[PDB]
Design a protein around this ligand. Sequence first.
Ligand code: IS5
Ligand code: IS5
Lengths: 294, 293
Amino acid sequence: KMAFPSGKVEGCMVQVTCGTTTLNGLWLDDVVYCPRHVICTSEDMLNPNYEDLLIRKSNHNFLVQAGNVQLRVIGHSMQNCVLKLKVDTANPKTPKYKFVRIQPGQTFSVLACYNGSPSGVYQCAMRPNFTIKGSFLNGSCGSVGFNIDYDCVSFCYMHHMELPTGVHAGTDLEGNFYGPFVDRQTAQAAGTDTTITVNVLAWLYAAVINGDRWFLNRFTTTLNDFNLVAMKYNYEPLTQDHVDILGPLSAQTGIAVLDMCASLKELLQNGMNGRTILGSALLEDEFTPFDVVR
Amino acid sequence: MAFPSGKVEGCMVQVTCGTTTLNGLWLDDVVYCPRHVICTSEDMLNPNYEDLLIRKSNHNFLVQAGNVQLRVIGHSMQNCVLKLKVDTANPKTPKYKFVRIQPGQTFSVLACYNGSPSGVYQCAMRPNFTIKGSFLNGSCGSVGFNIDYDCVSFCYMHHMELPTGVHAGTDLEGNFYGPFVDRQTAQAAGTDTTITVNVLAWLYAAVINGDRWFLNRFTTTLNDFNLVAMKYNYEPLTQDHVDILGPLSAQTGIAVLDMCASLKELLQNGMNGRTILGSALLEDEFTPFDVVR
Ligand SMILES: *C(=O)[C@H](C[C@@H]1CCNC1=O)NC(=O)[C@H](CC(C)C)NC(=O)OC[C@@H]1C[C@H]1c1cccc(F)c1
Ligand SMILES: *C(=O)[C@H](C[C@@H]1CCNC1=O)NC(=O)[C@H](CC(C)C)NC(=O)OC[C@@H]1C[C@H]1c1cccc(F)c1
């Protein structure tokens, strides 16, 4: 697992405090983005009226700091589950950036932060049930997930909560949660998780590129036939987008995506028969087709 | 999980000599890079580096930091690292130190190509003084490091891939880790061993994640455990290793030698299918300090 260099995101991290509640914010040009539950108390986390907590609030109740230096808040609004604080200084370290909503299966780096300070960077996969298996502790909220393409940081994740089971949930940078979660301090269950088929196929491609190709067969399949069988093994069905992002690996190896699906269908039905693929009896599902190139 | 890489990204530059390009580290007014940049092909196999270095002019070295060229006003060599004095001081130079790490210790690697950061990841110095990185052509000069408060401890610079696919390099004084040499030859490492204290830290970790199917009631002396460990090419466990595991022992209520008893069972049986924190294999590149923080 290889994360993206974090320096461009580090230069954007700040801290936002309401009362005693401190979490992290993302400072881009003259706007600071953070999770709205920074405005909550204990007495109101069990179920908050965010619209009502927000009316009581004024610009001068928001403490925003880069380091120990205060940024003056000159405006505030709420977009879904994210708070947007307008500040009086444009971040001179603002990279080229966009806000993207990723699909389940896709990977991203997360810059874990506490009190506006980075502690670590690591590589996460958005599971099909819209959770990530991270290392977030208290005060990690507002940490973000991202990919870097050339000069451009694509922000895709902001952290909000840990689930009873120990995995994590959050939103895009527009405040829309990934999955069926809500930012209330209630017990919330992630739907049952499935294996990320497109990434397994990416991994088989990687194994072929490295000369490990015992598992290829002379058969092929339809996308519908493969999908129905894979769901019987708790694999995700494939979309048309999945097929398309396997194109470069299909072209590199000369093995059509549906031929690879047929090889996977056989692995699913018969098993490995005590063999390995890239030195592993387990099919890895957290390397995307873009990750394999790198 | 790796250290944030921003402080190091701001030091990475591109160094070129001839048709060879790799990365350099630019601290204050000196750029450090692997000396084999001053090579060719007729040289690859048995290079007399002092000899090739004396034939070199300051102006043969092209240093680019972003869109900017840096003027080399001086060059010297410290073991396998070339030190290029340049006419400008990097203003992004962080607080730093140069350190040589011990096998079993971990560090972050910022992989760079043509002076540009491309990825970051966490590695351990294997006991045979290799590292299991993903380095491709042109990644030479990439560095490994740790961060303590505001200070970057640099510990590795990347020089070569071995034919098995693992990697070899030097500290920032240019001394290789391991018996490797910066000549273009197929080199083998000594037989690698598994970092025992790290496997134990990682088992304590899975426990903290409420994963404990591997535990047991059996127990073991420290010597009897080491006898089994050595049998399976695991590093011996020292009493310092035991002391270091204390915090994780306290936090889980599992004595160090109880976890050793658990590890002994796993080595002799196997996992018999089951898995620990996702892995079918015992993971040995998380240290105790790591798993804490
Ligand atoms: C950031 O503020 C923080 C990050 C959490 C803390 C621990 N690990 C993590 O990711 N997020 C919260 O505290 C969040 C605030 C809500 C308003 C969304 N709540 C949360 O994450 O709760 C975590 C424990 C598992 C929750 C739970 C279990 C059972 C019953 C509950 F009501 C809640
Ligand atoms: C950086 O310049 C580069 C990094 C390597 C390239 C491929 N992956 C990687 O990490 N370092 C070298 O190319 C290095 C230069 C020497 C002069 C030290 N040589 C190298 O990495 O060789 C790799 C293969 C195992 C070498 C080999 C096999 C057979 C015969 C040989 F003579 C050498």
